Amino acid sequence: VQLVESGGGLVQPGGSRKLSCSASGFAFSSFGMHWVRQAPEKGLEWVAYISSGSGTIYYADTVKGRFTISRDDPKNTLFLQMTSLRSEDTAMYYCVRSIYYYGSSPFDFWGQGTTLTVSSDIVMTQATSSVPVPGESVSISCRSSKSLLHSNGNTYLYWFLQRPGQSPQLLIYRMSNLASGVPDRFSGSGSGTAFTLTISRLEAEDVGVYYCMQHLEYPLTFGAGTKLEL
Amino acid sequence: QARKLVEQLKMEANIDRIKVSKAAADLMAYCEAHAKEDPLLTPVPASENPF
Amino acid sequence: ELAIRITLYAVIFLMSVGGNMLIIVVLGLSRRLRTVTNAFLLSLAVSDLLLAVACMPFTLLPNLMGTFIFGTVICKAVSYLMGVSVSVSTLSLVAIALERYSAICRPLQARVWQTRSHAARVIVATWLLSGLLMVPYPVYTVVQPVGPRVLQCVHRWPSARVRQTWSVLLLLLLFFIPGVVMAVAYGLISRELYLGKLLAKKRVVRMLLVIVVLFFLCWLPVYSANTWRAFDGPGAHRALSGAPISFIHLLSYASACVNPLVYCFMHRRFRQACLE
Amino acid sequence: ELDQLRQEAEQLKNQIRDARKACADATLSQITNNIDPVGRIQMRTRRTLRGHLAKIYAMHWGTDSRLLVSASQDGKLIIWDSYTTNKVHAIPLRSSWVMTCAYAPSGNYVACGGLDNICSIYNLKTREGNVRVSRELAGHTGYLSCCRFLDDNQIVTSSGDTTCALWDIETGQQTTTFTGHTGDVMSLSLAPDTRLFVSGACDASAKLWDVREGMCRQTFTGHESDINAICFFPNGNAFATGSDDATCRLFDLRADQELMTYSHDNIICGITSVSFSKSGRLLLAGYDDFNCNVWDALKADRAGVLAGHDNRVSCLGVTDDGMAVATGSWDSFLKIWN
Amino acid sequence: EAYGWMDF
Amino acid sequence: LSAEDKAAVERSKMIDRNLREDGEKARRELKLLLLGTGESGKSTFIKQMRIIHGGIIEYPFDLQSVIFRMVDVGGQRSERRKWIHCFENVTSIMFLVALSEYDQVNRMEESKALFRTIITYPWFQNSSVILFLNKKDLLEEKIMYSHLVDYFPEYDGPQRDAQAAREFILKMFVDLNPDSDKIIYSHFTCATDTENIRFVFAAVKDTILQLNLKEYNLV
């Protein structure tokens, strides 16, 4: 599987642009796609969501009305038409795939992004900003605003890891299950409104930032982040 | 063709068997010691039924 | 004298209401007789029961009483029910004829689209069109007494060329076009049966002829007399006021006893009714 | 030559018959006299899973007791989520003549085979979000009647060419061929520990096969016609066989003989499916009359009826936690009783 | 005059 | 319903929509069951029916907005009693007999017994039978010096290369039908005939027409 995004560049404030993400290697017709942007030195933020078959569309409250998402299944592309870009959209826009059924792991494969330059909500707080760290166990904590545990027993909280100069990836979905291709040294646990991630025997290429996302109400708020430095 | 059937019957011939009443007693013992966890023989209240 | 008149009225009323209620309960509580034509038969039986228990009393009682004591609402409602039920019965007869044509003259091309989800669509379209077409009657069915106490509930039309044009519209669009459509469809069916036991074919052909001729014989005098009234006015009232028009409406409602007898109560289907 | 072999076979058959008759002390219908009856169990259809457009020929529960596959003759294999009735996958088959279906214990694979002689194995938990055939195990001669997973890499199949086989999914070829039956092989069921398995044939006999060695151990025969279904007691030392003479039977693996027979004078139609309960006290049995029955496995007296189907029931399954019973039938509706 | 009928 | 249960229900509704589309696509087509006897030579038969612009095998034939499916159960050691209830909704069977096999040992009585067995199953009650009689020219060239009157018992007709050999065998194969309800659409196909496809289309159209007569109360 692979996602390649295209667009971006220098854009005058108030203009327009279109971002095109080409998907190669998977069944694009069956995947609901997201857009997750990231400011220069800030954390992730949800932007838009288009379902499978385009039958269900959502947007963020700060980009409601002036963005328009669409998908082309025959050509296997995803389009985001952006209009009247404010000076607060100079962000790298990642494209996220996600398929929802009983036993699935959404947000599994995020593609690369395009860097523009434009010349209520469940407030989640990762209080840890920087933890010093190899070979020793470390722990990260995330605190939710309201109870994320739903009536059917599922607790929707996901953990993502972003390394320096790469795209964040799915570590743990629903606070318990491990994603595929993830080393077994990661573990996740906790209770309603207090969640923790434990790592054992740290190795190289493991420093980075950890984001705790919720998937309960669809503004899909993210966390602040926690950088693990040497 | 013809030796295979007699060979298999001889393999099955020298076989160990037990009495029937012992097997029946073991069967009843299993039907009893695990009856408290049978949601079809003794249905569970509507607070545990997921259907 | 009059004994034969109320006698035939009661006979056809009891026969109609009984047969139609039986047909309804059978084809509704059988759960296995779900074909493309049983939907149309059930719709025709429902419209036929409506025809009977809505039209017969309010036609026999006041035509003898020489007055309408039943009030404006009753007069307004019964008019709309008569108009809707006659149109639904006729359109459902034409729908059955066209379904049989499509399914006996080109069956391989009819296997594609003939499904119950199409019969239901056609039935609801028929009912909606009939309800939308007969709204004019309620618009003007006021009971205006002539003389001291006659009342005479009638569908006085707003102005000239609305009595005549609407009557002619009913005559053509509901007794010539449906009549010729049924005649031609059953003629083509008889032809493709003649092409390719021999009694089991001429029996079907004779039955188709009986259906067509009973439709024409039943609903000819009613529409003829309606147009006679609508054009000439008081001539028809002076001609066929008391006795005759009751027999004419008797002919009309005889289709209420004909339809289930020739469509359902034959053809060995009554074994399922006796089974119920 | 042939005469001596035939005579020795007949003599040893009489020997084994008299042997299994020697260790026959008393019936089960007496040892279970001082037992309180279960009464009458009435179950109501809690779910009704619809979406198939033809007969439903097989069905299998996932080990999490929530998901279940079902295979139909319209070329579809649908994976329902029984709790909320949703569909998770709808796999389109290559040959739409299927007669069996299985679900892996881990929950990764499914399998199906039919009149095309080939057992296809579909891989659900893959990348690319699709559902593609992993292997197509071929090598049988007749149709495949049943197929039951052991691990994610081994599968036992039984075919109408009078043989069973143990396929290694990885390589793709038979690692063991179980032969000895005379008629077709219509159904198969594995022991709870997956070291033995029983198989029912059309010559009025069921056999106990040892997966390790690969040769028959015991041969049970007390029916009068073909055997359409079979299922183990949850203990592992007994199994029930449904036939076409409208009689189930319960045999014992250590007594080497038959214990009980379940039959009423009213039921005359064949039996399509058999299953036990979690405790194993009850015994669900599907019939051609389009209604299930719940026999009392310890007293042989019928203890309920589950009549909710319009056409013959062809598959019947009990969850691993005993919390429900799914029954399928030829009207394209499989229902979930509880 | 004479009583007037109601069509069908 | 949480944020993911709604998406699961949407995916389920799309799955069910695709099920409905594929089902209505597979309702248009008709399915025929080809059941040939031993050494009846249906290989050349299907070859001919396929060349002139026509385990288990399915041959699809596109004929004037219709799609036939010739289902051939080629290799089966399953005694025919356990899988046949799969084909209980077929429009018509296609029995394929041979004429020249009234001499091989005889072989023809086996074909008669097979026809009688298949025709009386309770699954084939809404499906007509379509006989074919291949190898007709072999009968015409072989009926000489044959003395057919000794192999089959009665044979009232002439002991020569008369047309009786072709009509006598059809009468034998028709007299095994439970009468007054089912019609047998016979045919005398040669090795190099060409109208097999047209005759199959005609017999299927007639079958559907009679089923619609029975179903639409028009009888």
Numbering used by the authors:
A (entry chain E): 2 to 120, 124 to 137, 139 to 235
B (entry chain C): 11 to 61
C (entry chain R): 53 to 248, 324 to 403
D (entry chain B): 3 to 340
E (entry chain L): 10 to 17
F (entry chain A): 5 to 58, 182 to 232, 240 to 353
Tell me, in the authors' exact words, what the paper reports.
Cholecystokinin (CCK) receptor family belongs to class-A sevenfold transmembrane G protein-coupled receptors, and is divided into CCK1 receptor (CCK1R) and CCK2 receptor (CCK2R). Hence, CCK receptors (CCKRs) regulate a variety of physiological functions including digestion, satiety, emotion regulation, pain sensation, and memory process. Here we report the cryo-electron microscopy (cryo-EM) structures of CCK1R–Gs signaling complexes liganded either by sulfated cholecystokinin octapeptide (CCK-8) or a CCK1R-selective small-molecule SR146131, and CCK2R–Gq complexes stabilized by either sulfated CCK-8 or a CCK2R-selective ligand gastrin-17.
The relatively high-resolution density maps of the four complexes allowed confident modeling of the CCK-8 and SR146131 molecules, the N-terminal 8 residues of gastrin-17, most portions of the two receptors, and their corresponding G proteins. In the CCK2R structures, the C-terminal pentapeptides of gastrin-17 and CCK-8 share almost identical binding poses. Though gastrin-17 possesses a distinct amino acid sequence and lacks the methionine after TYS, surprisingly, the TYS residue of gastrin-17 inserts into the same hydrophobic pocket of CCK2R as that of CCK-8, except that gastrin-17 interacts more extensively with CCK2R, including F1102.60 P1142.64, F120ECL1, V198ECL2, Q204ECL2, and S3687.31. When aligning the CCK-8–CCK1R–Gs and gastrin-17–CCK2R–Gq complexes, gastrin-17, especially the TYS group formed considerable steric hindrance with CCK1R, perfectly explaining the critical physiological fact that gastrin-17 selectivity activates CCK2R but not CCK1R in the gut where both CCKRs spontaneously exist and modulate distinctive physiological and pathological processes.
